[PDB]
UniProtKB/Swiss-Prot annotation:
Protein name: Serotransferrin
Residues of the full protein shown: 23 to 353 of 698
Annotated positions binding hydrogencarbonate 1: 117, 121, 123-124
Expressing tissues: Expressed by the liver and secreted in plasma.
Species, as recorded: Homo sapiens (Human)
Location of the protein in the cell: Secreted
Gene behind the chain: TF
Function field: Transferrins are iron binding transport proteins which can bind two Fe(3+) ions in association with the binding of an anion, usually bicarbonate. It is responsible for the transport of iron from sites of absorption and heme degradation to those of storage and utilization. Serum transferrin may also have a further role in stimulating cell proliferation.
Record-listed Dimethylated arginine modification sites: 20
Organism domain of life: Eukaryota
Disulfide bonds: 6-45, 16-36, 115-191, 134-328, 155-171, 158-176, 168-174, 224-238
Domain Transferrin-like: 3-325
Glycosylation sites: 29
Similarity-based family: Belongs to the transferrin family.
Assembly, per entry: Monomer. Part of a complex composed of SLC40A1/ferroportin, TF/transferrin and HEPH/hephaestin that transfers iron from cells to transferrin.
Pathology noted in the entry: Atransferrinemia: A rare autosomal recessive disorder characterized by abnormal synthesis of transferrin leading to iron overload and microcytic hypochromic anemia.
């Protein structure tokens, strides 16, 4: 009863190893176990699982779309939840963080340098670019090029740096792993902090995860859709959108989902939020959001009938779909 977890590169690899070793000490020998398979990007993890080389990997809802597509055909099986065990949230808010006093508003993002969690991810890409692409007087709608031209240099992890070097200007190569310091929610944040980009498309918990003190966080703001700015504390009324939970995907058939649930259930039971000091499934000295998001507080089993589209919902799938085809209101 072994679940082959897909770690994306070194840090994740290291956490996966500790995840395997610590589970071995709390799970009876006849229980689920963790086998660590290391890959270079989430995409490879998707391909590996589809090829029956790995069994599970956690993906942002946006990337759940990709995993679904044939010949992958993966499905969401266990979702992460946030907030607290006492008030679980299977969603989060996409926010546009900026430094206080940088002056620009949402409508003045053109020519700025942007930091994205990753190409095709909910908060760092789908939401912001979605609300942006069609308003573009410019019909360079094959997205990447249009975005590369809209902003004056960015970091969009997993974007093809060869065709669009503009998209990797802030993080040369657009590394698609935590080895790239500007990867993910917190990487995109560092990109802003360091002053490499003017804005960071991340989530409502991101700043709180990186800045322990209100005084420092006070030097940042959120860009609201009505072209005004709000304090990072007020994301409820200043966020770009509410997006679905990141989730663990598996093969639609022979995915070992049940075994996956067990592993993760028992895992949260022993090393969930604030359970143990010897191991934390939701944090690591090796980095942020390795394997699972630090903001997650546990997991929820996805209903058996749910395929990726039912999970993402009609509007999001349609949006992602139009996004990738540049389908815009009118034509
Ligand atoms: Fe996300």
């Amino acid at each position: 009863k072994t679940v082959r977890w897909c770690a994306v590169s070194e840090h994740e690899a290291t956490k996966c190893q500790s995840f395997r070793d610590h589970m071995k000490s709390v799970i009876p020998s006849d229980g689920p176990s963790v086998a660590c398979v290391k890959k270079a990007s989430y995409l490879d993890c998707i391909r590996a699982i589809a090829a029956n080389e790995a069994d599970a990997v956690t993906l942002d809802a946006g990337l759940v779309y990709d995993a679904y597509l044939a010949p992958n055909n993966l499905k969401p099986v266990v979702a992460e939840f946030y907030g607290s065990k006492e008030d679980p949230q299977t969603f989060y808010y996409a926010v546009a963080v900026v430094k206080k006093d940088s002056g620009f508003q949402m409508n003045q993002l053109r020519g700025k340098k942007s930091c994205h969690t990753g190409l095709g991810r909910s908060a760092g890409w789908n939401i912001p670019i979605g609300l942006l692409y069609c308003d573009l007087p410019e019909p360079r709608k094959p997205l990447e090029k249009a975005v590369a031209n809209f902003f004056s240099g960015s970091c969009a992890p997993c974007a093809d740096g060869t065709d669009f070097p503009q998209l990797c200007q802030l993080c040369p190569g657009c590394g698609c792993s935590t080895l790239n310091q500007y990867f993910g929610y917190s990487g995109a944040f560092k990109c802003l902090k360091d002053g490499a980009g003017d804005v960071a498309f991340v989530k409502h918990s991101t700043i709180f995860e990186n800045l322990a003190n209100k005084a420092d966080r006070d030097n940042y703001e959120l860009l609201c859709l009505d072209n005004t700015r709000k304090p990072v504390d007020e994301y409820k009324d200043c966020h770009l959108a509410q997006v679905p939970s990141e989730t663990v995907v598996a093969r639609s058939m022979g995915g070992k989902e049940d075994l996956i649930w067990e592993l993760l259930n028992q895992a949260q039971e022993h090393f969930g939020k604030d359970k143990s000091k010897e191991f934390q499934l939701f944090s690591s000295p090796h980095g942020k959001d390795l394997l699972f998001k630090d903001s997650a507080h546990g997991f929820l089993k996805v209903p058996p009938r749910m395929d990726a589209k039912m999970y993402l919902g009609y509007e999001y799938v349609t949006a992602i779909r139009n996004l990738r085809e540049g389908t815009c209101p009118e034509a």
